[PDB]
Amino acid sequence: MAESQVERFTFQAEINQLMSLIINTFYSNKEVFLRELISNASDALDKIRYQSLTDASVLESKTELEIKIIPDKTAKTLTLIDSGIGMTKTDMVKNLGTIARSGTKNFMEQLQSGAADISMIGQFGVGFYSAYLVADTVIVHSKNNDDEQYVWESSAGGEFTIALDHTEPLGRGTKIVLHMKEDQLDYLDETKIKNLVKKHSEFIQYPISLLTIKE
């Protein structure tokens, strides 16, 4: 018998609103979700990279600085793994939903006024939530040098959970799994995703591997 403690958290009110907005509104061009996944991976990779300049020991958990992108049609998932800095449990609790952040209300206001469109979400520091343009459920596995591996999960609806992660160890970094909406499964088509990764990684300084799963 396996045993696991799972903690449930409620999204901050504005974050809940933003998630409903991203989910319950039709947006015709959703490819920003991929730009954001890759940009966030790159940011996390930058952070560990710069940390390694002043402290070489930070890389001992995983030497490679790389991104892996894994479309899996059978599983209806898109997975993006980085070997960046990773996030502690508290990092994920604080930054993946409980704490109100500086750009949330401003983004929502600009969405409604037309000052911003959905593709500009990243500028407001809430680009993670763009995953809900294409996914019903998002799972974030993360491993920071200062903590054990944890797994965050949400299907929106106002709550997330976080638990000690007993799945494949990352060494260091973050593995985000998007459980794709039935209407957005075309994002798992091999050629489509390969080419979109090319399109949205033009300024990325880290190796990317595209691993297409066949079952």
Ligand SMILES: COC1=C2C[C@@H](C)C[C@H](OC)[C@H](O)[C@@H](C)/C=C(\C)[C@H](OC(N)=O)[C@@H](OC)/C=C\C=C(/C)C(=O)NC(=CC1=O)C2=O
């Ligand atoms: C400048 O940093 C960014 C912030 C500030 C803050 C959260 C940074 C975070 O603090 C713990 C780490 O320093 C950073 C390395 C981790 C990531 C980028 C994670 O990505 C991966 N692959 O690790 C991302 O994972 C889903 C987590 C939150 C992202 C959010 C909520 C977002 O919507 N936009 C943001 C994008 C950013 O670039 C954002 O708010």
